[PDB]
Amino acid sequence: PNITNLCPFGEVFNATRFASVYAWNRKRISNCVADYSVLYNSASFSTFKCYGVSPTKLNDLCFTNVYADSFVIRGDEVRQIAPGQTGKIADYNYKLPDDFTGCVIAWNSNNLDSKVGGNYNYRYRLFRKSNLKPFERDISTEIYQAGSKPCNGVEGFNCYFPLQSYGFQPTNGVGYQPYRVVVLSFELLHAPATVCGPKKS
Amino acid sequence: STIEEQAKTFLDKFNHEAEDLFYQSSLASWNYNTNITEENVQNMNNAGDKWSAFLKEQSTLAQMYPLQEIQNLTVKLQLQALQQNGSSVLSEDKSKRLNTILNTMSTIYSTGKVCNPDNPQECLLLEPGLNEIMANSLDYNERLWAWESWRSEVGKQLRPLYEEYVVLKNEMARANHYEDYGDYWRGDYEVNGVDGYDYSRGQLIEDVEHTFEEIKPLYEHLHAYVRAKLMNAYPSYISPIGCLPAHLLGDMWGRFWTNLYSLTVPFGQKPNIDVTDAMVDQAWDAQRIFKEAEKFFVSVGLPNMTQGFWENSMLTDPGNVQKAVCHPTAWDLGKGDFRILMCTKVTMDDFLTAHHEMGHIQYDMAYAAQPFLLRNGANEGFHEAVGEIMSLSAATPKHLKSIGLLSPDFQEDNETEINFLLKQALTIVGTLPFTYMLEKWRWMVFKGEIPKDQWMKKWWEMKREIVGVVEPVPHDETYCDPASLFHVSNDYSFIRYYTRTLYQFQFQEALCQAAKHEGPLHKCDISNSTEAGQKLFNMLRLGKSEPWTLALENVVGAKNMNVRPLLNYFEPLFTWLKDQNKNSFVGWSTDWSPYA
Numbered sequence: 001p002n003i004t005n006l007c008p009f010g011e012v013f014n015a016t017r018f019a020s021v022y023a024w025n026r027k028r029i030s031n032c033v034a035d036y037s038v039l040y041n042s043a044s045f046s047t048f049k050c051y052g053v054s055p056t057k058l059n060d061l062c063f064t065n066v067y068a069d070s071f072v073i074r075g076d077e078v079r080q081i082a083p084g085q086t087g088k089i090a091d092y093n094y095k096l097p098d099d100f101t102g103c104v105i106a107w108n109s110n111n112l113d114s115k116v117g118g119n120y121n122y123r124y125r126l127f128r129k130s131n132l133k134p135f136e137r138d139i140s141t142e143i144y145q146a147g148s149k150p151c152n153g154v155e156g157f158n159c160y161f162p163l164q165s166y167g168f169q170p171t172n173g174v175g176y177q178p179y180r181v182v183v184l185s186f187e188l189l190h191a192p193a194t195v196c197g198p199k200k201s
Numbered sequence: 202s203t204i205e206e207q208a209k210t211f212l213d214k215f216n217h218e219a220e221d222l223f224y225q226s227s228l229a230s231w232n233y234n235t236n237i238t239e240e241n242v243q244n245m246n247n248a249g250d251k252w253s254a255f256l257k258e259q260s261t262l263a264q265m266y267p268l269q270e271i272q273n274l275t276v277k278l279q280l281q282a283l284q285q286n287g288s289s290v291l292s293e294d295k296s297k298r299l300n301t302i303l304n305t306m307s308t309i310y311s312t313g314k315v316c317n318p319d320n321p322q323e324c325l326l327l328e329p330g331l332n333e334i335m336a337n338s339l340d341y342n343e344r345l346w347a348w349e350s351w352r353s354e355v356g357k358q359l360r361p362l363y364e365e366y367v368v369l370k371n372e373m374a375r376a377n378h379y380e381d382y383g384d385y386w387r388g389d390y391e392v393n394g395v396d397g398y399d400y401s402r403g404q405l406i407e408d409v410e411h412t413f414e415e416i417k418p419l420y421e422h423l424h425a426y427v428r429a430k431l432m433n434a435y436p437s438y439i440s441p442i443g444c445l446p447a448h449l450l451g452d453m454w455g456r457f458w459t460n461l462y463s464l465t466v467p468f469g470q471k472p473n474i475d476v477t478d479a480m481v482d483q484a485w486d487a488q489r490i491f492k493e494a495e496k497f498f499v500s501v502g503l504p505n506m507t508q509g510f511w512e513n514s515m516l517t518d519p520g521n522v523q524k525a526v527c528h529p530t531a532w533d534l535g536k537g538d539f540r541i542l543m544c545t546k547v548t549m550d551d552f553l554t555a556h557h558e559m560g561h562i563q564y565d566m567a568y569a570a571q572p573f574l575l576r577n578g579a580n581e582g583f584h585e586a587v588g589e590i591m592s593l594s595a596a597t598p599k600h601l602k603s604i605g606l607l608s609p610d611f612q613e614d615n616e617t618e619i620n621f622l623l624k625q626a627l628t629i630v631g632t633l634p635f636t637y638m639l640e641k642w643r644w645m646v647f648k649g650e651i652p653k654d655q656w657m658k659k660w661w662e663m664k665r666e667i668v669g670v671v672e673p674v675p676h677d678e679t680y681c682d683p684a685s686l687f688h689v690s691n692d693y694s695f696i697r698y699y700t701r702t703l704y705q706f707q708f709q710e711a712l713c714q715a716a717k718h719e720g721p722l723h724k725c726d727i728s729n730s731t732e733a734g735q736k737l738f739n740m741l742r743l744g745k746s747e748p749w750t751l752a753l754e755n756v757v758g759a760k761n762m763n764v765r766p767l768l769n770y771f772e773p774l775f776t777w778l779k780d781q782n783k784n785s786f787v788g789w790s791t792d793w794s795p796y797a
């Protein structure tokens with residue numbers, strides 16, 4: 001063994017542009033050797049929480065595929081991304097199952113996303129009829145209804161647009177600074193395992 | 202789904218989009234204030250009205266929800282703020298006239314000028330000058346001249362403007378389901394929610410003079426002592442029976458008696474406490490002052506302040522053409538942004554002002570988690586009291602010696618303590634009767650108890666028993682004396698300053714009790730006590746979410762506003778004054794006048 005076909009983590013953590021939270025990007029990783037030590041041994045990550053397995057032991061066992069979900073949220077909303085949590089993000093945008101196994105990484109990106117006049121590209125859902133199922137993505141832009149009369153399109157009294165934008169500014173304090181979040185999930189279907197670390201020698 | 206869910210959805214939609222617009226308006230205001238230029242003027246306006254242009258529609262939309270069926274107290278309280286018709290209830294042709302009359306009144310007050318008749322080509326303004334003449338001078342004739350001139354060239358044209366202003370504002374008051382404008386002002390001290398904590402608007406009237414009567418024995422002795430000292434200063438001008446005139450106090454309106462400290466110093470052989478030269482010797486800059494003002498709050502237990510406050514705040518000395526108006530302020534721009542603005546210098550006064558603004562910033566940071574419409578103090582009197590507590594507690598000799606400014610071998614004695622106590626009393630307790638009398642007169646004039654003719658005589662007769670001030674020269678009906686005041690011509694409520702003192706003293710007494718201190722209250726300190734910090738934080742974090750009666754239950758043990766801590770603070774001074782004026786008699790005669 002010579003350790004080849006490295007998994008492309010650079011294309012995920014160092015992507016030029018990220019997607020909105022209501023349209024989070026999902027990437028499938030398989031059939032490659034992955035090195036999580038280079039990720040864990042980095043001081044650039046503000047939050048690194050592993051639930052299913054301990055980070056050090058992760059280099060031994062291996063699965064049949066991995067899924068990376070990437071998006072951008074606010075600073076105060078990182079705590080909502082965890083099993084058994086509630087909130088706007090955890091209900092209408094991104095929900096994790098209670099039996100989740102994997103890891104969550106979140107780092108500040110104030111110097112990139114924020115703009116002097118205000119960055120309004122990122123959006124999120126504010127209203128929804130019912131809570132989301134785990135790993136379910138909803139991108140519909142139907143006009144919301146809260147009252148009793150049905151509204152034909154245009155916003156009325158109780159008819160609001162379900163999507164609202166973010167107002168990132170250079171000077172907002174750590175509470176409101178943008179944060180980039182990547183969630184790694186390991187899935188272990190009946191197919192033979194293919195994604196695990198180098199045979200050290 | 203009832204209307205209660207619709208209200209929640211509407212509020213959730215509203216506050217999210219209100220936050221950004223408010224932040225933009227605050228940013229524009231800060232940009233103008235830090236950098237005074239024409240280019241940065243219109244921008245403020247271009248934001249300002251727009252913010253208002255957004256606040257009106259949401260106020261218009263908060264009427265289809267019938268706020269009598271909503272059961273959640275928080276939601277109802279949050280919605281009550283939006284349902285304020287304000288001046289929109291008046292007709293447009295009257296609203297424009299009201300705006301015009303306020304603008305012209307403000308301009309007239311701000312453009313006062315007096316020329317000495319010998320030199321009619323050089324008038325002075327209320328800026329340093331005439332005010333300096335009235336404050337720092339020793340001459341009866343020129344003081345009387347300045348007083349009469351200012352009340353005769355500003356107090357004459359304001360009578361019809363104020364006459365129309367009163368009736369127009371009163372019609373607005375009936376338009377807003379109030380029988381008087383006094384009720385509109387007193388509405389902030391009103392709660393009708395939790396049982397046992399209810400407080401009505403009318404109760405404040407009976408509650409003010411109930412707690413004012415206990416202060417009269419303390420005020421009478423001060424009046425007698427000041428009158429005796431003025432007699433020993435001014436010969437054959439102040440009778441020992443009557444009360445002192447208006448223009449000898451040391452201020453244009455007599456709001457404060459600080460300027461009189463030079464004449465009425467008890468025994469000035471020993472020097473006063475000053476460490477400014479010590480600060481200069483140790484080479485203290487603005488950073489050192491603002492870091493020593495932060496270590497105190499850290500030691501108490503309050504959280505450390507965020508990064509970026511040191512980067513964005515204009516701490517000191519704009520310097521060149523980059524000018525700035527730097528009345529000391531603490532700015533809460535929203536979205537987790539806090540700043541300060543000051544032209545700091547190396548002086549103990551700037552040290553105390555820095556502590557005051559630091560307390561303001563801490564209180565602002567305390568309730569950042571509340572919704573947008575609940576980010577304020579419980580009432581208008583809590584914020585300044587919280588600010589002034591730190592100033593009171595950061596000037597004791599023990600705290601000064603702890604940070605090593607005073608000499609470690611300093612011994613205090615009778616006279617310096619008594620002198621400092623009297624110096625503080627000349628400012629704190631010497632202004633309560635003036636505020637009480639002014640607010641009482643304004644309440645009655647809005648209620649219409651005194652008719653139009655009974656204006657200038659009722660004011661001056663009441664001032665005699667309430668305050669103890671006589672007429673220098675009579676005014677019959679053609680003057681408007683109260684109009685020559687900032688808080689009377691600019692439409693500002695004046696009852697805040699009366700409650701601020703009692704609130705601050707109650708808070709200080711409660712903290713010192715729960716800080717394990719022994720001795721007189723005025724020497725107490727709240728440093729290195731984490732339980733006191735926790736006790737204060739438990740109330741600071743509430744914001745406007747709870748009634749102020751409940752807020753006055755975690756710091757102190759009684760919801761009512763009493764005066765016992767005030768009397769307990771000035772106990773040594775009172776017991777010295779008891780034996781001080783053993784030959785004179787306390788109290789004044791209301792009939793003696795300088796002219797007749």
Ligand SMILES: *[C@@H]1O[C@H](CO)[C@@H](O[C@@H]2O[C@H](CO)[C@@H](O[C@@H]3O[C@H](CO)[C@@H](O)[C@H](O)[C@@H]3O)[C@H](O)[C@H]2NC(C)=O)[C@H](O)[C@H]1NC(C)=O
Pocket residue numbers: 009010013014
């Ligand atoms: C995303 O891009 C950043 C920036 O390049 C990557 O961080 C950087 O990664 C390189 C190598 O991957 C590190 O270089 C190191 O240099 C020292 C000598 O100075 C050498 O001894 C090490 O073995 C290593 O080669 C570099 O320190 C590191 N950080 C910075 C600030 O450049 C990052 O790895 C990329 N993301 C992913 C998932 O790879």
Ligand SMILES: *[C@@H]1O[C@H](CO)[C@@H](O[C@@H]2O[C@H](CO)[C@@H](O)[C@H](O)[C@H]2NC(C)=O)[C@H](O)[C@H]1NC(C)=O
Pocket residue numbers: 272273274275276
């Ligand atoms: C009014 O509504 C608010 C928000 O729905 C309620 O606040 C909740 O209070 C409970 C009390 O323990 C907390 O556990 C929740 O976290 C709070 N927020 C939410 C979203 O539920 C408040 O209690 C309500 N007031 C009432 C019912 O009197």
Ligand SMILES: *[C@@H]1O[C@H](CO)[C@@H](O[C@@H]2O[C@H](CO)[C@@H](O)[C@H](O)[C@H]2NC(C)=O)[C@H](O)[C@H]1NC(C)=O
Pocket residue numbers: 264265284285286290
């Ligand atoms: C604020 O002004 C509105 C507009 O007039 C008032 O709403 C009216 O109130 C009267 C009686 O109070 C009703 O007969 C009307 O049907 C109401 N009209 C609308 C469009 O609601 C409101 O009462 C005023 N006071 C508030 C909101 O406190």
Ligand SMILES: *[C@@H]1O[C@H](CO)[C@@H](O[C@@H]2O[C@H](CO)[C@@H](O)[C@H](O)[C@H]2NC(C)=O)[C@H](O)[C@H]1NC(C)=O
Pocket residue numbers: 499505506507508
């Ligand atoms: C706020 O104050 C706290 C308490 O002093 C700071 O925490 C420590 O501060 C010292 C010196 O300021 C540092 O040497 C330590 O490394 C800090 N420890 C930790 C865990 O932070 C804190 O850094 C201060 N924060 C700011 C922004 O000034």
Ligand SMILES: *[C@@H]1O[C@H](CO)[C@@H](O)[C@H](O)[C@H]1NC(C)=O
Pocket residue numbers: 002
């Ligand atoms: C193994 O990989 C290294 C990587 O630098 C390469 O130099 C070497 O030639 C490779 N050898 C074999 C047998 O694949």
Ligand SMILES: *[C@@H]1O[C@H](CO)[C@@H](O)[C@H](O)[C@H]1NC(C)=O
Pocket residue numbers: 236238240241523
């Ligand atoms: C102040 O405003 C003027 C007007 O545009 C501008 O030229 C100058 O750069 C500003 N100064 C600062 C420090 O922002």
Ligand SMILES: *[C@@H]1O[C@H](CO)[C@@H](O)[C@H](O)[C@H]1NC(C)=O
Pocket residue numbers: 614615616
């Ligand atoms: C302080 O007061 C006490 C009691 O009157 C007196 O005995 C003492 O001499 C006084 N000390 C000074 C320095 O005045």
